[PDB]
Amino acid sequence: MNIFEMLRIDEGLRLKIYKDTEGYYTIGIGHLLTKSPSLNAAKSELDKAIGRNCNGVITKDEAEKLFNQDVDAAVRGILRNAKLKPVYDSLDAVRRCAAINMVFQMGETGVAGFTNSLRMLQQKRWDEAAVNLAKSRWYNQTPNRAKRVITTFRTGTWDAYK
Numbered sequence: 001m002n003i004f005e006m007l008r009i010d011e012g013l014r015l016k017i018y019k020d021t022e023g024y025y026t027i028g029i030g031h032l033l034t035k036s037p038s039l040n041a042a043k044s045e046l047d048k049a050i051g052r053n054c055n056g057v058i059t060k061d062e063a064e065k066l067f068n069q070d071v072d073a074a075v076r077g078i079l080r081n082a083k084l085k086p087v088y089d090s091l092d093a094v095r096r097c098a099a100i101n102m103v104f105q106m107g108e109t110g111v112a113g114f115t116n117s118l119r120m121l122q123q124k125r126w127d128e129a130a131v132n133l134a135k136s137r138w139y140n141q142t143p144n145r146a147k148r149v150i151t152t153f154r155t156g157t158w159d160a161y162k
């Protein structure tokens, strides 16, 4: 297991524009296109991201390339954020994957607001962090995915994904 396999499981793969769990236009392996309700706006974002006129459809190679860029952007967002970087650097490799997963799903600013969870993670209070992470809109709106991510923080293993 690695971060790419973990997020591929959590996000799936769809080659045509779809709506994510929040109702936002998305493509590929969970690549958000826009929060605008305009499908044309989503199609313009797609063409810009891919570099060609796609008509709302991409290839699997294109989906995987977008996915690699998106994972890297999540990592670089963590490393440039004064609240997230110290927690990230305190974690082992498996738990770092759980952190990237959260930033991929909710964005750097969203995860940076989990101030008390982040402190408990940095203190390595895993069960306490797990309880605190579940007290969130995130857990309530996507409970199966949040439970997998939280189990990864709690145990430091890939057991939720096996």
Ligand SMILES: [Cl-]
Pocket: 141, 142, 143, 144, 145, 146
């Ligand atoms: Cl879910």
